């Protein structure tokens, strides 16, 4: 065979059954990522996620150089690039990891249809998720489960997730080395941020370095107030790009449990984090409108306020609430925030305060999060906004109290909002309540150096609970 492995997600060599299928009885294999630099140039996704991708592709190229191959980064779109590749390379086989997302499913059907009309064998494997999403849906009567316990109940009737596949070996990549064009292969070199049209003046080191190598080092390190800060053990961005396999993560947790607890089978709760991901993957896959309200079959139609101004303040960290604003700032700057911080800002935007559609929240998170995941992101926003999944009521977060309770020192705020450095702890979560004297001593006048709160939380959250109540009454 003359094989191409197409990377999209699954940005790794370990647990890559699709790559193994590419190399099996192959004369030649080439690993490609297809990247349209003019699409990248116009994309509204911010630099952090774009940077993470490039760094992941850099690491993949470094891993391939140790197997005496290289990554081929091909400039263009799959549709008008593949036919050129199929001929120029004499391609016999095309492989890739399965994409369960409605758009991805769509694109890939078109790619394999063209591949069949070209005499090219296509092989896919579903290694991005723990389970075969389609099987879960079949077991549920051809609809996805819309509650977590129903999901868990389906999961309990199925075989355990597949174990991580054996990684391609140092010598198996010898029997089908690609022919590297000397120093000309940099026509397939990994693009820089400047190439992708990003300004990079005073950038500085990534807090979250992309790539498989980093993913595996982070997972190994973990298996052994400040929780708001970026840990050297956050795996979400790695899972999202497939730098880390979810299956390896699952069974490595399993092994950890078996060593710590000995004579014990782990509870489903050990794997809850990965299972929540699976749950949203399952709900999303047959729903082309999953990230919308209108025309979304599982979403309650809610008359959210159209308030572009409020949305911009929320997005820009200019609400009047230091906890909210510090979160949005860390998000924009670093591209990762804690789960509880995500809940806090999402609640504020939607049913807790601003009454703005969860859809606008999804879009802001998609632009800023390193781990921005179509399935998980939209699912999370729908769930917490009580828009889907039979939720109806949810966790109540005070845009003052919740920060006070998570970090009483206020040091988190002082880090992300240095203008508020000077306020004592008893005021820093609600500086509008500091006396003028305290404000002056902190060298930050509220309404001048930092905005007044943009809503009265007490009254607005009260108004909203009645609005939500009115929606579910007429609903039934
Ligand atoms: C509004 C909102 C939006 C979100 N958007 C995203 C998103 O775009 N991408 C994303 O990956 N996660 C999203 N999450 C889930 C969660 O907040 C992050 O996955 C988690 O904070 C990452 O932290 P961690 O890596 O330390 O997770 P860990 O505690 O290490 O959990 C391990 C992995 O499990 C997954 N996970 C954990 N919790 C959840 C959950 N509740 N739902 C689904 N998956 C989970 C993540 O992939 C994470 O890497 C969102 C949550 C909310 C409330």
> Per the annotation, does 449 bind a ligand?
no
Q: What does the longest C-alpha to C-alpha distance in the chain come to?
A: 78
Of 6, 262, 233, 199, nearest to 111 by C-alpha is: 6
CB 239 near ligand 1, within 6 Å: yes
Contact 180, 189 (CB under 8 A): no
Sign of the dihedral through C-alpha 341, 345, 347, 352: positive
Tell me whether residue 291 is exposed, middle or buried, using C-beta atoms within 10 angstroms of its C-beta: 0 to 12, 13 to 18, 19 or more. buried
Contact 51, 210 (CB under 8 A): yes
| 3-class secondary-structure state, position 389 | coil
The whole-angstrom distance between residue 208's C-alpha and the CA centroid of its chain comes to 13
Sign of the dihedral through C-alpha 280, 285, 291, 292: negative
Angstrom distances, CA of residue 116 to CA of 92, 109, 124: 10, 10, 14
Contact 290, 362 (CB under 8 A): no
CATH (residue range 128-164+212-287): 1.25.40.80
Tell me whether residue 353 is exposed, middle or buried, using C-beta atoms within 10 angstroms of its C-beta: 0 to 12, 13 to 18, 19 or more. buried
Cα–Cα dist 429/399, whole Å = 8
Contact 370, 236 (CB under 8 A): yes
CB 372 near ligand 1, within 6 Å: yes
Q: Which helix (H) or strand (E) holds 368?
A: helix 358-368
Angstrom distances, CA of residue 269 to CA of 145, 247, 285, 317, 392: 18, 16, 24, 34, 24
Q: What is the DSSP string of 172-186?
A: TTTTT-----TT-GG
Give the DSSP letter of residue 356: B
- Ligand 1 atom closest to Cα of residue 238: 49
Q: What is the DSSP string of 325-338?
A: HHHHHHHHHHS---
Cα–Cα dist 340/337, whole Å = 8
The whole-angstrom distance between residue 58's C-alpha and the CA centroid of its chain comes to 20
Cα–Cα dist 299/268, whole Å = 28
Chain breaks in the chain (C to N over 2.5 A) after: 224
Resolution in A: 2.2
Residue in 380, 386, 394, 402 to alter for ligand 1 test, most ligand atoms within 8 A of Cβ = 380
CA of 299 to the centre of ligand 1 (A): 21
* Phi, psi angle pair for 35, to nearest 5°: -135, 120
Cα–Cα dist 34/302, whole Å = 39
Q: Which helix (H) or strand (E) holds 132?
A: none
CATH class of 1-127: alpha beta
Cα–Cα dist 242/127, whole Å = 9
CA of 247 to the centre of ligand 1 (A): 16
Could you list the beta-strand ranges (E) of 76-136.
93-97, 121-125
User: How many other C-beta atoms can be found within 10 angstroms of the C-beta atom of residue 234?
Assistant: 17
Cα–Cα dist 47/68, whole Å = 31
User: How many other C-beta atoms can be found within 10 angstroms of the C-beta atom of residue 431?
Assistant: 27
Q: Which helix (H) or strand (E) holds 382?
A: helix 374-384
Cα–Cα dist 432/85, whole Å = 62
Of 391, 172, 195, nearest to 298 by C-alpha is: 391
Closest residue to atom 38 of ligand 1, CA basis:
273
CB 385 near ligand 1, within 6 Å: no
Cα–Cα dist 15/196, whole Å = 30
User: How many other C-beta atoms can be found within 10 angstroms of the C-beta atom of residue 445?
Assistant: 12
CA of 336 to the centre of ligand 1 (A): 10
> Per the annotation, does 220 bind a ligand?
no
| CATH superfamily membership of 288-473 | DNA Cyclobutane Dipyrimidine Photolyase, subunit A, domain 3 (1.10.579.10)
Cα–Cα dist 229/223, whole Å = 19
CB 371 near ligand 1, within 6 Å: yes
Helices 339-347 and 374-384 meet at what angle, rounded to 10?
50
CB 291 near ligand 1, within 6 Å: no
The ranges assigned to domains in the chain are: 1-127, 128-164+212-287, 288-473
CB 49 near ligand 1, within 6 Å: no
Closest residue to atom 16 of ligand 1, CA basis:
339
Angstrom distances, CA of residue 204 to CA of 201, 209, 248, 371: 9, 12, 32, 20
CB 380 near ligand 1, within 6 Å: yes
Buried residues in 194-227 as b, exposed as e (16+ CB within 10 A):
eebebeeeeeeebbbbbbbbbbbebbeebeeeee
Of 460, 471, 450, nearest to 398 by C-alpha is: 460
Residue in 9, 52, 236 to alter for ligand 1 test, most ligand atoms within 8 A of Cβ = 236
CB 277 near ligand 1, within 6 Å: yes
- Ligand 1 atom closest to Cα of residue 369: 8
Give the DSSP letter of residue 160: P
CA of 234 to the centre of ligand 1 (A): 10
CB 285 near ligand 1, within 6 Å: no
How determined? Answer: X-ray
Cα–Cα dist 44/60, whole Å = 25
> Per the annotation, does 273 bind a ligand?
yes
> Per the annotation, does 26 bind a ligand?
no
CA of 339 to the centre of ligand 1 (A): 6
> Per the annotation, does 236 bind a ligand?
yes
> Per the annotation, does 373 bind a ligand?
yes
């Amino acid at each position: 065979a003359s094989s191409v492995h197409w990377f999209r997600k699954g940005l790794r060599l370990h647990d890559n059954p699709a790559l193994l299928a590419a190399v099996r009885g192959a004369r030649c294999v080439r690993c490609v990522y297809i990247l349209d630099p003019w699409f990248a140039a116009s994309s509204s996704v911010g630099i952090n996620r774009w940077r993470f991708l490039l760094q992941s592709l850099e690491d993949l190229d470094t891993s391939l150089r140790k197997l005496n191959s290289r990554l081929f980064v091909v400039r263009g779109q799959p549709a008008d690039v593949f036919p050129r590749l199929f001929k120029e390379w004499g391609v016999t086989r095309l492989t890739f990891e399965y994409d369960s997302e409605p758009f991805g499913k769509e694109r890939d059907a078109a790619i394999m249809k063209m591949a069949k009309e070209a005499g090219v064998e296509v092989v896919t494997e579903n290694s991005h998720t723990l389970y075969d999403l389609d099987r879960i849906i079949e077991l549920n009567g051809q609809k996805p489960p819309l509650t977590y316990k129903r999901f868990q109940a389906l999961i309990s009737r199925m075989e355990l997730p597949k174990k991580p596949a054996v990684a391609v070996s140092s010598q198996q990549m010898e029997s089908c080395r690609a022919e590297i064009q000397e120093n000309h292969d940099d026509t397939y070199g990994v693009p820089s941020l400047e190439e992708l049209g990003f300004p990079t003046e005073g950038l500085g080191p990534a807090v979250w370095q992309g790539g498989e190598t980093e993913a595996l080092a982070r997972l190994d390190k973990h298996l052994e107030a400040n929780s708001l800060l970026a840990s050297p053990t956050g795996l979400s961005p790695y899972l999202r790009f497939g730098c880390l396999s979810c299956r390896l993560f699952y069974y490595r947790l399993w092994d950890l449990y078996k060593k710590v607890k000995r004579n014990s089978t782990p509870p489903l709760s050990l794997f809850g984090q990965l299972l929540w991901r699976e749950f949203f993957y399952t709900a999303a896959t047959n729903n082309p409108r999953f990230d919308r309200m209108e025309g979304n079959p599982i979403c309650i139609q809610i008359p959210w306020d159209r308030n572009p101004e409020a949305l911009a303040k929320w997005a820009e960290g200019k609400t009047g609430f230091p906890w909210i604003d510090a979160i949005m700032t860390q998000l924009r700057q670093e591209g990762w925030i804690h789960h509880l911080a995500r809940h806090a800002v999402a609640c504020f935007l939607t049913r807790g305060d601003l009454w703005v559609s969860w859809e606008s929240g999804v879009r802001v998170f998609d632009e800023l999060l390193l781990d921005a995941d179509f399935s998980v992101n939209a699912g999370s926003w729908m769930w917490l906004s009580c828009s889907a999944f039979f939720q109806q009521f949810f966790h109540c977060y005070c845009p003052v109290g919740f920060g006070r309770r998570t970090d009483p020192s206020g040091d988190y705020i002082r880090r992300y909002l240095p203008k508020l450095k000077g306020f004592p702890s008893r005021y820093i979560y609600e500086p509008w309540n500091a006396p003028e004297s305290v404000q002056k001593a902190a060298k930050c006048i509220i309404g001048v150096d930092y905005p007044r709160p943009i809503v009265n939380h007490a009254e607005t959250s009260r108004l909203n609970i009645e609005r939500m109540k009115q929606i579910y009454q007429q609903l039934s």
